[PDB]
Symmetry: D2
Subunit: 115 residues, 4 copies
């Protein structure tokens, strides 16, 4: 698939399991339209969000529900969520892997983009 997200937990040293996230695409009228959504598996991965045909050129936002994740573990975290906003497929189709590391008061994200 052309878009997948993997989430790790820096407190437990484990994948971050059952983490919900919503993907949006920027529309012509500059609003965010719902594009896809899912949650991470027991390996902390979310696959199959979209397809090569559906995943057209555009600006995308992945909003990761880190707050509910920490809350379910008894932690009151700093962030409401973690976002990743990027232009995709500008120079042709690419595959995107979004990696996120979660702590109660911190997060890191990086992107691996391949042809």
């Amino acid at each position: 698939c052309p878009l997948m997200v993997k989430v790790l937990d820096a407190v437990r040293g484990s994948p971050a399991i059952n983490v919900a996230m919503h993907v949006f695409r920027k529309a012509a009228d500059d609003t965010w339209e719902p594009f896809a959504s899912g949650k991470t598996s027991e390996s902390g991965e979310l696959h199959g969000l979209t397809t090569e045909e559906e995943f057209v050129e555009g600006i995308y936002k992945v909003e990761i529900d880190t707050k509910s994740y920490w809350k379910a573990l008894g932690i009151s975290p700093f962030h409401e969520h973690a976002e990743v906003v990027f232009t995709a497929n500008d120079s042709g189709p690419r595959r995107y892997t979004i990696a996120a590391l979660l702590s109660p008061y911190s997060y890191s994200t990086t992107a691996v983009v391949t042809n």
Copy 2:
């Protein structure tokens, strides 16, 4: 100073200078209301965004224009911008330092919350 942002550059090993950001507060209708804004100084710091009187409880969004930063350095960035979204003062007013570290395909942010 109840809210301070500090931005570092992971490619050049320096403060990230002249980085523009806007701070929003979530309104009752769930849209983002402009609240404050500024550019990081030569030390990568942005101060005096708000005061303790004005900085009431609510959900705040700091949107950092990382894309313009990398473009000025002649480097192609992944993200459109970096966001930090958080609930402020849920236990009564505190002081917030938001630290962000920027790379072209990655960013890390952490909060320091003091009394």
Copy 3:
């Protein structure tokens, strides 16, 4: 395998390919003994460093040659290398995944430990 390392490049948004690393184990005399070594593949992964039988309880050090990596790309980085030092298998055999993200002046590492 019980120990694998994956390395990403935060400047290129890609795996960090052909990154050399050496693993050492702490000996009885408190010296570092060579344990295994390898380099990352085109997916930025290094597998097959060791086996369940060989990978006994101990303190291990993974020393990642980040300097040569950046140098080969024309960058003079801050760090000589990135280390990860940890006690392994203290409560019984585990599988360790070491993830590292590289920038010229920064690095991040996290560990995923599973049974």
Copy 4:
């Protein structure tokens, strides 16, 4: 102050206080020579490690006792310690800020190198 270290805690959203570290300089025989040491203050900072006269070109290692830090908080950590190894002053004397962010299974460090 030519060398300063600042440590943050990603679980508690605070400076990491009373974190002990030692700084070493590589000797001609490739062993690590004690050079300086201290504990982070209430602001997570450690200053006055060295002076511009004494801080000559060489390879320096800052070894941060992250393990003792987490143990005192009652939290099981992955790493034995965190290291930062770097060549200093290769273009003539500069000022170094080493920033480290600590989680139980992860750490991030970045350098700010100023003139």
